[PDB]
A paper describes a structure:
Using pulses from X-ray free-electron lasers (XFEL) with sufficiently short duration to outrun radiation damage, the structures of biological macromolecules can be obtained from nanocrystals at room temperature. The resulting method is referred to as serial femtosecond crystallography (SFX)2. In the double-flow focusing nozzle (DFFN) that we present here, an inner liquid jet is focused by a coaxial faster outer liquid jet that is itself focused by gas as in the traditional GDVN. Our DFFN system reduces sample consumption up to eight fold compared to a GDVN, can inject crystals in their native crystallization buffers, and is suitable for time-resolved mixing experiments and future high repetition rate X-ray sources such as LCLS-II.
Because of the low X-ray background and focusing of the sample, DFFN injection is also well suited for diffraction data collection of very small crystals. Cydia pomonella granulovirus (CpGV) crystals are the smallest crystals used so far for structure determination by SFX15, with an average size of 400 × 200 × 200 nm3 (and about 10,000 unit cells per crystal). Using CpGV, we further analyzed how the fraction of pulses, which show crystal diffraction (the “hit fraction”), depends on the sample flow rate and the type of sheath liquid, for a given crystal concentration. The average hit fractions of 8–10% obtained at these low sample flow rates indicates the continuous operation of a stable jet over the course of the experiment and the absence of interruptions that often accompany experiments that use GVDNs. Even so, either the use of water or ethanol as sheath liquids leads to stable jets at much reduced sample flow-rates as compared to normal GDVN injection.
Residue numbers in the entry:
A (entry chain A), B (entry chain A), C (entry chain A), D (entry chain A), E (entry chain A), F (entry chain A), ...: 6 to 248
Amino acid sequence: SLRYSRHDGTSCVIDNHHLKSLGAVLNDVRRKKDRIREAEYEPIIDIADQYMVTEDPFRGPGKNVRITLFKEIRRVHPDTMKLVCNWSGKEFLRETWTRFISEEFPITTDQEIMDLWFELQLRPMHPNRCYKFTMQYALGAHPDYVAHDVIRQQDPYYVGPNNIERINLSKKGFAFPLTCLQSVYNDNFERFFDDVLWPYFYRPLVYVGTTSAEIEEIMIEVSLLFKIKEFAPDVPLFTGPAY
Amino acid sequence: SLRYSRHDGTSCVIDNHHLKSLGAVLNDVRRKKDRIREAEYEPIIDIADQYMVTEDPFRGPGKNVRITLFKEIRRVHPDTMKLVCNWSGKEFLRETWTRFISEEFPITTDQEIMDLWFELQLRPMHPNRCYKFTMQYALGAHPDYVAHDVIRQQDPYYVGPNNIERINLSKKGFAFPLTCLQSVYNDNFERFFDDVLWPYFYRPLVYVGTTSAEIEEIMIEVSLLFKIKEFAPDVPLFTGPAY
Amino acid sequence: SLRYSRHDGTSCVIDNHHLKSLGAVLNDVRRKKDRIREAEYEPIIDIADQYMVTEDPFRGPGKNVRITLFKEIRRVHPDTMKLVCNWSGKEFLRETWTRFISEEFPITTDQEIMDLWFELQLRPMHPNRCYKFTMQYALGAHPDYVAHDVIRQQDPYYVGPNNIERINLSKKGFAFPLTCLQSVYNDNFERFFDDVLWPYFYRPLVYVGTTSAEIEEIMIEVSLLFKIKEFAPDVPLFTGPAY
Amino acid sequence: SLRYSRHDGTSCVIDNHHLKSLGAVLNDVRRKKDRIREAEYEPIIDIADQYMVTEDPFRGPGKNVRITLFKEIRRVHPDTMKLVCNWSGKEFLRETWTRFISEEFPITTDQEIMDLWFELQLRPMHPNRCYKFTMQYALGAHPDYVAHDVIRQQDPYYVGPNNIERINLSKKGFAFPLTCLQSVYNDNFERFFDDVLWPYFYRPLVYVGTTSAEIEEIMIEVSLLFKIKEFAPDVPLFTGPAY
Amino acid sequence: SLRYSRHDGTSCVIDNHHLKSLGAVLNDVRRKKDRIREAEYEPIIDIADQYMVTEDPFRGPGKNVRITLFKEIRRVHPDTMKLVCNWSGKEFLRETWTRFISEEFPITTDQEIMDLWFELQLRPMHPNRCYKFTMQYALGAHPDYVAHDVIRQQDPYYVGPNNIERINLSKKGFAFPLTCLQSVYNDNFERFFDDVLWPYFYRPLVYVGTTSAEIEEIMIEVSLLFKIKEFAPDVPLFTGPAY
Amino acid sequence: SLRYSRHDGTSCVIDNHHLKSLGAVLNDVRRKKDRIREAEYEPIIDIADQYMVTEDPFRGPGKNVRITLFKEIRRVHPDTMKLVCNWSGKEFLRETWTRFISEEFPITTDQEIMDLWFELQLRPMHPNRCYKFTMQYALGAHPDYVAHDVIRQQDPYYVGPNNIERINLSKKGFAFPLTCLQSVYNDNFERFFDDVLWPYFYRPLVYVGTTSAEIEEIMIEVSLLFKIKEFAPDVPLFTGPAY
Amino acid sequence: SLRYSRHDGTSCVIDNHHLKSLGAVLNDVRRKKDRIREAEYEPIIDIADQYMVTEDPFRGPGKNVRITLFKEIRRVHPDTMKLVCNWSGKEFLRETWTRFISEEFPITTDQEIMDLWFELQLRPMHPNRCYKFTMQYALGAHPDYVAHDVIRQQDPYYVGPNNIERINLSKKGFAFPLTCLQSVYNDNFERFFDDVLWPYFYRPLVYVGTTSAEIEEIMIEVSLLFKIKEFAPDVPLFTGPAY
Amino acid sequence: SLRYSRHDGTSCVIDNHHLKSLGAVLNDVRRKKDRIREAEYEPIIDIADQYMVTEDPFRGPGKNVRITLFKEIRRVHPDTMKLVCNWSGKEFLRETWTRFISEEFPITTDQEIMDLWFELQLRPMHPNRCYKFTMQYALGAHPDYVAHDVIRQQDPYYVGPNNIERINLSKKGFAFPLTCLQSVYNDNFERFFDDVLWPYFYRPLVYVGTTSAEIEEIMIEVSLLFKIKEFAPDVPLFTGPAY
């Protein structure tokens, strides 16, 4: 933050003649030099504007609601990964519906869930170590298929710089307690579960490993991150009766 | 554009001895210096080629057909947004089908609609103002759910530099008058409407606001932008009878 | 002039996710880098804003009226200067009043003469010469003092780059046909002359030389440059009778 | 100073073919590169040519005549200033007229005093000190008003880098022994004094201090600096009788 | 091209004091900085002025007269070259004398042929190819020696950037229709041929190839380029009788 | 050598949308920046293309045949030079003809000797010395003029960086065993010698010295370097009878 | 010139441990950095070593003997050139032989004239002019052909930076008083003239002009510049009898 | 390493004229530019040559003999250090004398031990850790003073980058098996021990720790490093009898 907001200097008049601050005039000269530079490179920006980048979903539009679920410790051998969660489809839907509804109610505004994200957050439990985290996942399997508790690493997802991976769970597969833009109605888990077509097939199965050449002890925080658009009218709240 | 196409200079022969332009030889020396620079940074480009960017859909493959729909003026209070359109699902499909078919017919070539985009284009109606535009949208709701005409802003989409937002309307939800790669058949709105499964559920509901601390008057142009691949054969058009 | 007015690129939305042009995002990054640079040097501009520069009176406020008077050729020896004009006070006031009034009438607006300038404009009369111009002047002397037609140079005024010197003639000494902010009245040279206190004392006596080591032939255009503020009301001109 | 005056190299002809020095050709190439740079920045110079700076009166037109008056030592406490001179108006005019006339006579040429400057020149009298000089002045007061010999500092004039302040004494207030462009006549102090309207009102009263946090011993040289334009004709001096 | 010819800014005089444009003063400062740079590198230019370069004969002194002779197409295998011309000495002299004399007559001025050049000009006949041209030549052989129509490439002349090779044909070997500085006399091919000592020995035999790894189709324009100095007097042409 | 041949990155298509490697897109942006730089300096290259440089005859067209002649040791005093060879014209022609013919025969291809060069190659015979070599030569003199075996240095030729001087021996003066483009005939030294007009006048007389301030011991290799163009047809060699 | 010859610093030994000057160690580090730079650019120098430049004949091998001939003044109209000399072949040979022999005798050493140059040296005769010089020449013509005293300019030779053109006069055409490497014999102009085959055909005819748009007065110094190799033995001169 | 040893390019002579490689001439120009830079900074090197740095004793004069003694593992708590060795003075002298003599014998040359160093070399025993090593030492104490096996860290020596600390053991305190420059005599530990004045007082007591916030397992190699000057004559070794 600068102190003058580019309003540096002033002006005055002596004998019809106009004086202006030297620093301000030098800025005018330097801004003309820069302006010429902008036009010189504008053709180069047009070549770059042939392509686009994507806005961070968590720093971007919509609000973040982090429904934390549980914590867990794992010790992982080198070149392996351990399973983080092994819920069935039903148990996953119970935690999803139950934790979101009981945290957010009363839901007083029309809104829509933009995206549902599975958040895997990792931190070391010893100091003076240097390694990075790795991840692998699946999202569906035979209800009587029980996943390996440990696997060897092969072409995993390298966890990002802040030690957080967020995995999108698309509305096609994973059911949301709020489907579209809607007001809430009277609802319960039983009618929610009954309206899910394949309740036992879809569940997140996530593994975690490291790039370390020794065993490492990992602390894990798992959460569901909801992106939500609210449509709150521009009206007052009154105590009844209104007016 | 340069005048010589890097064919600067020439050569000649005097007494078996070869002469070449000094400027051209200096370019050869500088190109060798640059070529060495390319190889020095090639390992750095490999680190950048681990990731990819996306090509502008409107400057990229396919042609653009802008079916403009209507214009509208709105005055928006600070920290609020006003609804742009409130059509039902049926009225949206009538405008979509009717305006595209009557603008494009006769459709003389096999083709496919790649993408359907809702275009929101905004321009100020007073000069000497400095603010940016914001946007929020929904795409589905109860047919008897009527949207708020004005809402307070919360985590909106910031409109891009040229004051244009284009919102993709995926084939899953919004019905296209041309589904796949096909030739046109005899068609009408009634049979089109009858084959849409959920005609009354999906409609774009878009809001617009500003980053200004005062009321601002906005002019709005709404359009449907179609991306289209044509498959025109490499054959002549003759007056009948051919040959 | 640049083609996009810093509105480079655009934005669009695919599956709730926001895309923006790569060139525009890189400009945002570079503008942040520059903005940090501005704040780093703002303390330096404050040291420069302790002092001020003066605006060019001829490119600055007020309009320019160039009442050209006469032309003249002179041949000047090295290290000398020749007199340009030798009018008495009365003859100078006749040219001043007569030429300005007959050029500007009808004077239809309230106005004030800000400054009166004596303009000496010089151009070579042979090609392929390289030298600069020099100048010296006086403004008053005994009416029976007749000035030397030629003098040796000593510490002269070096004429500026465009070969124009403009010498201010302050209202204290030299009388203006329009003293202050006023509408014109019925006027003539005789009543103007009668109201000048010292009509025979003040007259510009200007010399011109060169930095050349040989005789040079100079063409001279002399003019009076008036700086004028007009106070024209924001009202229409009608043909009488009005309304 | 360079040794070749940009006439570096030479040329010769062998078998109709023209050879030229390599160093000279490289200068031609570099001068073209610079010339392109000049044109690229010419628009920036136009923004700077909206304003003007003022030429040093003492390095610029006119000659300098330094009529030194007296020397003085003062010891000044921190945050104070001591009076340098306390002459009445008459005593100041006696020194001004007497010292200039007796130093310059015989005045053999027509001339005019452009400006009269009061010069205050300061030097330390101990080594290994680090401080700057400050100044304050007045120019008129009741003849029976006697100035304070010492004052506290408040918003003083900071003396320039070379430890010299020169204060203009305008012809309106302070009388010159040579009013305009004139030849000298028989003159004396009594008729000069009689023609000064307010001889006892105008006199320079100048104070001097420092930026030091300890007492400092200052040596002072006071002078009157005259700027003078001479109008010496381009004619010989002969022993009489001429020709 | 710049707009002010380094006459940027101006000057004026207010109360004896000289003002000059800020942009012009900054140029004076920057020119002093550059001038110091010139002197710093002048010793380096002296080391480069130990050697010389040669002026382009075709951009340099003398005028160019391009007597085009014929055009030709060739298909050249990789690593080979095809003969361009196979004239005998007599046939070459007939084309040389005949084409120059009939193109240039009437030759109305005293002049001398500085140099005679064989011009080989090459252009591709397919687009979207990338290769360069090569050349080899001989100038004399037994009159009954008939040259190979195709040869393998070995250490050829690499054609210059603009696809033009010009081969000097020295006056010792190849006869000129105008030997020295002369006016034309009545002349014909028979007396020209009779005065050539070895008319059948000297003829240009030129080959052309490529750097391509495939057959390429080449279009060829062959010409004789004369360099000519004219000595036209500074006199008028009149209709007879003169005066 | 770089690993990708500027084919860095790739592309793919997801949901009609085109993705391209980030590193490749950044190269496109940087190449546009460079391309703009090329056009900015193209006017400067045109000033340099007014002149030309000469191609190294030994790295350039034609093949090199180094007919080494003899070796020699000399001790040279400071500021002096010793004669390298003192052959008469006849003895020089015997070595020239004899050594070239017996080394090159059988000469199976039509060819022409472009240039004949006298090669003087020098190397120190003590380590840990620092000096350069110098050279002087003559090419003709009275047959009974015997050259000084040692001379003082005055304005000599400074030998090049690699300690090799090559002196052209023009066909005018020094006779070649192969005059023009020709096939070989039955030949011998006696008929070769008989056809040389001035066999005893032309012989290379070369001196060698140093820039050292002490005696230095020099090893010398002398050779004749022939530049040769071959005209080998594009035909097979068969064992007879052919076909 | 530097003061230490890169022998900066020293060394000493304290308790077996070696100390060395910090400045010297930093030079060792910087020299390693530079040495790495040399190797990085060595591949670029190899591309430049494909071509060669030519050493200034007058700053290079051989000594210069400037036999000045005459001086001359000319006034030249714009776009014209005036003849400098109009001697016949015989008169040119008389000046050449006579002036060289009488200036150089006694010629006490074996020597050879490397080159003969016609030197045209030009200087302005007015100050404060800015123009360059131009040149054109011929070398042979009919003895009864008398050249135009003035011609219009067309594609002239632009004189070099130092206002000197030197035109080579090859031994083929122009006869030298010393043909080869030789001792002098008894000689005279008559036997010299008798042995010149074409004494009346070859003579330098040189014109001079300017790039000025006005008449200019030129001073001309003409000279013959001889390049000479001496072969002075390393022997003493004694007074006779020797030893 | 570069390929040409700064002998880039060559030279040749054509028609008395000297040609030299362009790349070599450009190096000459750049070397002159650098040489000017050296002289510009030579005054700055003189300011740095007021001070000196010390040569690495182990990369510098003398040879290194590393008498390794033992290896050891320690586990060290954070902010603590463990004792590495606890020998008495006698046991230290036994290892010193015994290990050096039995490793080096036969000692066939006159020599002197310059310095004796205690080498502490440290390496981690787990991967993927990030910490540095610390050290503290004493050299003498009461023979019946037994040192603490572990201490808390306070202002320790930070081990160097390569994880090696070498501690000088001065000849005053610690006895050497070879005192000065000497040949070996018949010697044994008992007479060596008897001639040490204070055999039980001086012994190295060294501690080791880390900068880690967790326990770390360290592997330790301890050695005595001898610096030795040999004085081997320049004479042959023969089998007896010699000659």
